[PDB]
Design a protein around this ligand. Structure first.
Ligand SMILES: CCCCCCCCCCCCC/C=C/[C@@H](O)[C@H](COP(=O)(O)OCC[N+](C)(C)C)NC(=O)CCCCCCCCCCCCCCCCC
Ligand SMILES: CCCCCCCCCCCCC/C=C/[C@@H](O)[C@H](COP(=O)(O)OCC[N+](C)(C)C)NC(=O)CCCCCCCCCCCCCCCCC
Ligand SMILES: CCCCCCCCCCCCC/C=C/[C@@H](O)[C@H](COP(=O)(O)OCC[N+](C)(C)C)NC(=O)CCCCCCCCCCCCCCCCC
Ligand SMILES: CCCCCCCCCCCCC/C=C/[C@@H](O)[C@H](COP(=O)(O)OCC[N+](C)(C)C)NC(=O)CCCCCCCCCCCCCCCCC
Ligand SMILES: CCCCCCCCCCCCC/C=C/[C@@H](O)[C@H](COP(=O)(O)OCC[N+](C)(C)C)NC(=O)CCCCCCCCCCCCCCCCC
Ligand SMILES: CCCCCCCCCCCCC/C=C/[C@@H](O)[C@H](COP(=O)(O)OCC[N+](C)(C)C)NC(=O)CCCCCCCCCCCCCCCCC
Ligand SMILES: CCCCCCCCCCCCC/C=C/[C@@H](O)[C@H](COP(=O)(O)OCC[N+](C)(C)C)NC(=O)CCCCCCCCCCCCCCCCC
Ligand SMILES: CCCCCCCCCCCCC/C=C/[C@@H](O)[C@H](COP(=O)(O)OCC[N+](C)(C)C)NC(=O)CCCCCCCCCCCCCCCCC
Ligand SMILES: CCCCCCCCCCCCC/C=C/[C@@H](O)[C@H](COP(=O)(O)OCC[N+](C)(C)C)NC(=O)CCCCCCCCCCCCCCCCC
Ligand SMILES: CCCCCCCCCCCCC/C=C/[C@@H](O)[C@H](COP(=O)(O)OCC[N+](C)(C)C)NC(=O)CCCCCCCCCCCCCCCCC
Ligand SMILES: CCCCCCCCCCCCC/C=C/[C@@H](O)[C@H](COP(=O)(O)OCC[N+](C)(C)C)NC(=O)CCCCCCCCCCCCCCCCC
Ligand SMILES: CC(C)CCC[C@@H](C)[C@H]1CC[C@H]2[C@@H]3CC=C4C[C@@H](O)CC[C@]4(C)[C@H]3CC[C@]12C
Lengths: 182, 182, 182, 182, 182, 182, 182, 182
């Protein structure tokens, strides 16, 4: 008798663990990031950092005046239980500064929410974790509750918005400070 | 013998809970919101608040004279048992007021029904919970029973309708007070 | 032994209740309502009432001379065991009266059959239950057995037909009293 | 022991009744009825009666000289075990008579076969059961064995055919008596 | 114990009978019959008889000089274990005779094979069983082994072929006796 | 106890026989036969014989100068365990001889291989078994190992090839003896 | 008791053998062979030999100056556990020699790897096993590691490459010795 | 009793091993490698080496001025638990050096990450393992964290990027040293 209830309990347990790992594998997170360059300067040397998740495509090397970044990052495949969270940065040699854009689309919406930010750092810098913790904690991010606007200095500003869901769209326009948004 | 009826009862229970969570995951709620700007003024600084549910796309930053918002919010993914309920708001600098539009598509139609409303608040204001409780309780909403019309002051009015189902369409035209609807 | 036949009887019972609720969910009722405005007057302020069922789309605000309502109502989703039954009404300010159109596509064809009607009430009135009980009991409805024709007064009449099935099509032409149907 | 063979016999019985009702639901009957108006007169006030089965579309109100009825009736949904059997009738005011067309596509081809007929009654009459029993028993119908032809009086005749299967096509041309068929 | 092996044997038996009736339902027989009218005479009053099987479409009333019959008959739906076997006949008033075409596509190819024939009978005659037994037994049919040719009298002949399989194609050209086939 | 292992062994046996007959039903054999008429003579009275397998389409009655036979034969449906093997023959009245083409695509490639042949017999002859045994045993066939060429007499030759698999393509060009192949 | 564990072990064994034969049936091998004729001579009398595997299409009889062989061979259907390995040969009468091309795409990549070769033999020769063992062992083949080049004598050379996988592409250009590859 | 729990444990074990090998078979790795030739020199004699994985297509023999390599390598089919890792190399006779490009897309991202590199070796050299260990360990590779740039000598440089995921895209532009990237 007794080994039959052990094998039956083993099949019940793998029935639970199969459904658990198939749920965590089918819970999806992504952020379609559009950054639109109305700045009047060429961006170059495009770099990216992921705290969580990844892209399949490359970021483009450069954005000319009036062109856009259109970049699609997504969470890791399989039952990973992490969101998509990262930095995108470009150097702007016409002003000697690097624009960094951050997004955060979490896995668990009880603990976290969608956040985004952008800032214009001094010099040429690669995108890395020190920009993520700054753009997420040391400077005020935005809640994904519609459109927001902020100055960058050097005659620049941005306006942008993010959708509040796990399939997110982030849209930013980087503009001259003297001009109307969108 | 006895552990075999415990594992059989465990599989019966997970058979119930699988069918329960698959029912709550496949019960769908959405509201296709169209707001049409026949106002003669440019709307800007678009903001949104969700009491329940979310959008995937962004709301557009601005609506010019004769253009429309076309915005699609939907309930949260998975077995959540909540509807889609929210506010949409734009600033109108030509009059110094913010138009806020509200919809409410509930999960459980025994307790609740489809409602919508719109109002024109003083000053520039972000969309938030204080507009939701006002547009839903402190001002009279509309029952989703065909077309309705109301004045906003400052030479504006709206007419609109909402469908009575869980896949809802809300349509609003915002107009000069002196002009015929649709 | 005995608890094994209780769990086997529980699985038999949920096998019955699953097939019952899947039958009631897949039994479908709808009425494609076409109302064609050959009246020579503009209709406006479109309203609708459901005794049973719902639409997904909005009814259009107004119908001009030579245009049509094309409106699709359907029963509630899931295992609800109710048909689609309702009123549609428009105000006609050129004569000071409201045209109301009624349809009734029942769930259970042993007790009920497809019925429709139309009438032209005095003044501006919203579509509601008092028009449903009138158009269904206090005035003679039509059996869905081919084409029928009736005068409305104020120089108007209608002709129309309804198909006899649970996927119904209702077609009405509203005409000048002095003119030939279709 | 004994309750286990009762639940096993209950599942065997619902396995039979599921396969029985799925067979009766998937056994399909329909009749694509074409009636072609080479009569030189306008037909109007189109009416229909079903002894068994139904249509989804409406019959058209009128047929002008050289136009056709193209009408699709079918058996009732689900495990109903009845065919499609009915009358179609139009008034012809140029002669003061009503053309009635009958078809009969049975469920059980051991007891029954495909039959059709047409006749030209005096006056304006609605399509009903008294025309069905007449067109099926009191006047000689046609066996669905190729093309047949018959005079109607008032200078009219018809020729037509019906296919011998449960997915039937009925084709009739109504003609001047002095002219060649098809 | 014993009733459990009776219910197990009942489920084994319905497992056999399900597979038997699904095999007999999916064994398909059809004959695409093309009869091409190079005769120089109009054919009319088209009739058909089935010993076994049926068509869904109608046979056309008439074939003019240079036109074709293209007619598709098939076995009865479900587990019927019968082939498709029939006669097609037209009257030819220019000579006072009726052309009859026969095909036979059997269910069981151990007992039977594909056969076809055609003959030109005196007078106007409906297609029926007396033509089937004549065209199949009292006159020599053709084996479905490529092209064959035969005179009909009255200045006519035919040439034709049939494919040897259960999805059959029969092709016949009816010609002036003085002219080359195909 | 004992009848339960008999019913379990019966279900095991029908599990084997189902998989056996589904394997023999899904093992497929066909030969796409192209015969290209560069002969300078019209071929006519096309005939065919199958030792094994069948076609669905008809062979064409005649091939004119520069036209092709394109003919598709295939094994019998269901679990038959036989290949496709046959003769195709046409009469050539310009020389008083009949061209016969043979192919053999076997079921079991341990015992057999793909073979083909062609020969030009005296007089008008129907395609039959005496041509099959001649073209397969009494004259040397070709192994399906690329292109081969042979004279026919009367100023004709052929060149052709066959693919070595169970989905076979046979291609033959029949040519004047004085001309280059393909 | 004991016969129940024998039938359970029989079903376990056929569960293994079903999965084994379905794995060996779905492991696929093919070689898309392109041979491009920049030689300045016409190739003719195309022949082929398979050590393992087969083609469905025919090899073309001849390749003119500037045309290509495009030939697709593949392993045998079902659970055969053999790769695709063969020779292709053409006669070149302008020089009195036959070009033979060899490929080898094995089943088991632990024992074997992709190999290919080509050589220009004296006289007209059919493709056979003596060319396979020569092109694979008696002359040095190429490893499928990118592009390779070799002289053939008579003023010819080739360059070619093969991909390293079980779905292989072989590309060869046959050229004048005095000219640049691809 | 006891053999029944052994066969039940055997089926549990093959249930685990089936799910294990189906997971390792459906975990996919690939690298879409684009190498863009803005060098002003023709590349030729294209070669490739795989440490792990394979391509289906061939690498092109040569790249002219302004053309691109577009090459798709992928991991081995089935449950192999290895990534895709390799070298691509071309000779550049205008400078007497060979460009080698390396990528590494690992299976297990706990131990490893995406890496790439490129270098310009002296002389004509085939792509092999000595270039892989050099490009991966003896020269500094790049982390797949956005765009990077490096000089090659002989008046050349490259810029490129790689995406950080298991479905990777590698993009490299090879340029004159005096010119701006992308
Ligand atoms: C004793 C041990 C046995 C117990 C466990 C055995 C269970 C096997 C578990 C199977 C795990 C699941 C195996 C693998 C992969 C999943 O990634 C896919 C993807 O799904 P998607 O296309 O919908 O979208 C996902 C999109 N992202 C890429 C995540 C962003 N499923
Ligand atoms: C002991 C514990 C075990 C018991 C529980 C194990 C059961 C696993 C439950 C699986 C839950 C269900 C897992 C997940 C997701 C569902 O969201 C989808 C979506 O469905 P949709 O495409 O039709 O539309 C939905 C559209 N909205 C987005 C909701 C607006 N299914
Ligand atoms: C742990 C145990 C759980 C496992 C079993 C759970 C039961 C599964 C089956 C229940 C699925 C239930 C799926 C149901 C429903 C909603 O989708 C629809 C959508 O409405 P609409 O979009 O069309 O618009 C029309 C609505 N108004 C016009 C505005 C009124 N709403 C309704 O009101 C119908 C609900 C009417 C449906 C209520 C009747 C269902 C009763 C189920 C009892 C079964 C259990 C008995 C014990
Ligand atoms: C102990 C309790 C457990 C017992 C009950 C568990 C059983 C779960 C029941 C599942 C209920 C069924 C769950 C839900 C929904 C059905 O609405 C769909 C729709 O079907 P449709 O697309 O064909 O057309 C329907 C079209 N209308 C919209 C009705 C007009 N199925
Ligand atoms: C103890 C009680 C339990 C025993 C019974 C439980 C069994 C549930 C039975 C399910 C009944 C079957 C439930 C319902 C519907 C069928 O109508 C569809 C339609 O099929 P169709 O698309 O192929 O064409 C049919 C076309 N017509 C419309 C008939 C003309 N199936
Ligand atoms: C105790 C009694 C229970 C035992 C029996 C219960 C078993 C139910 C049997 C189901 C019978 C099968 C039920 C019905 C229909 C079959 O006709 C389709 C058609 O198939 P087709 O589309 O491939 O082509 C067929 C084309 N023709 C029309 C035949 C010419 N299947
Ligand atoms: C109650 C028990 C019943 C359950 C099991 C029933 C068995 C199911 C499997 C049988 C399906 C059987 C399905 C079979 C067949 C017909 O479709 C084909 C169609 O032919 P064609 O259109 O291609 O043209 C080619 C024909 N000619 C060239 C003119 C000769 N005809 C044949 O002759 C082949 C039959 C040759 C096939 C005969 C061999 C099958 C033998 C089955 C024995 C299994 C039972 C043993 C006990
Ligand atoms: C005690 C008796 C019971 C044991 C046997 C019961 C088992 C039923 C057997 C079912 C037999 C199988 C029943 C029937 C038919 C097969 O012909 C199809 C066709 O397959 P295809 O489309 O892939 O290509 C085949 C193409 N050709 C035409 C062969 C040339 N399957
Ligand atoms: C006691 C005996 C019983 C034990 C064995 C019973 C098990 C039955 C085995 C079934 C064997 C498998 C039966 C047959 C065929 C397979 O060929 C297909 C093809 O697959 P494909 O389309 O993916 O590509 C394959 C492409 N090539 C052609 C190989 C090159 N499956
Ligand atoms: C009677 C019992 C039998 C039932 C169970 C049988 C096992 C089923 C699962 C095995 C399916 C196995 C299916 C496998 C494989 C071939 O398709 C690939 C194709 O390669 P390519 O085309 O991509 O080119 C890349 C190749 N090179 C670059 C040139 C090297 N070749 C390989 O080398 C990978 C094999 C690597 C795979 C080897 C690892 C599998 C080990 C299985 C052990 C399970 C049993 C343990 C007891
Ligand atoms: C006692 C022994 C029995 C235990 C084991 C029996 C289990 C059989 C195992 C079956 C192994 C699995 C059998 C075979 C193949 C897999 O390769 C496919 C491919 O999947 P894909 O299309 O999604 O992408 C894969 C793409 N790459 C090519 C990998 C790059 N599945
Ligand atoms: C059958 C009994 C002994 C169970 C033992 C499990 C072992 C033998 C099975 C289970 C999983 C299998 C391994 C899982 C997959 C891989 C990784 C692959 O790159 C090589 C084969 C290899 C290494 C398999 C070899 C055999 C294996 C290790």
């Amino acid at each position: 008798i007794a080994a039959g209830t052990i094998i039956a309990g083993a099949e019940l347990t793998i029935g639970l663990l199969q459904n658990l790992l198939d749920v965590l594998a089918n819970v999806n997170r992504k952020c379609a990031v559009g950054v639109d360059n109305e700045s009047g300067f060429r961006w170059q040397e495009g770099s990216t950092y992921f705290f969580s998740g990844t892209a399949d495509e490359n970021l483009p090397y450069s954005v000319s005046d009036g062109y856009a970044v259109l970049y699609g990052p997504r969470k890791t495949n399989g039952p990973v239980a992490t969101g998509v969270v990262g930095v995108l940065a470009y150097y702007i040699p016409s002003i000697g500064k690097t624009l960094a854009v951050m997004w955060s689309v979490p896995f668990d919406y009880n603990f976290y929410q969608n956040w985004w930010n952008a800032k214009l750092y001094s010099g040429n810098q690669d995108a890395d974790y020190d920009h993520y913790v700054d753009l997420y904690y040391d400077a005020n991010p935005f809640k994904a509750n519609g459109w927001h606007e902020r100055s960058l200095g050097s005659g620049l500003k941005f306006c942008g918005s993010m959708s509040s869901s796990g399939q997110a769209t982030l849209e930013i326009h980087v503009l001259k400070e003297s001009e109307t948004c969108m």
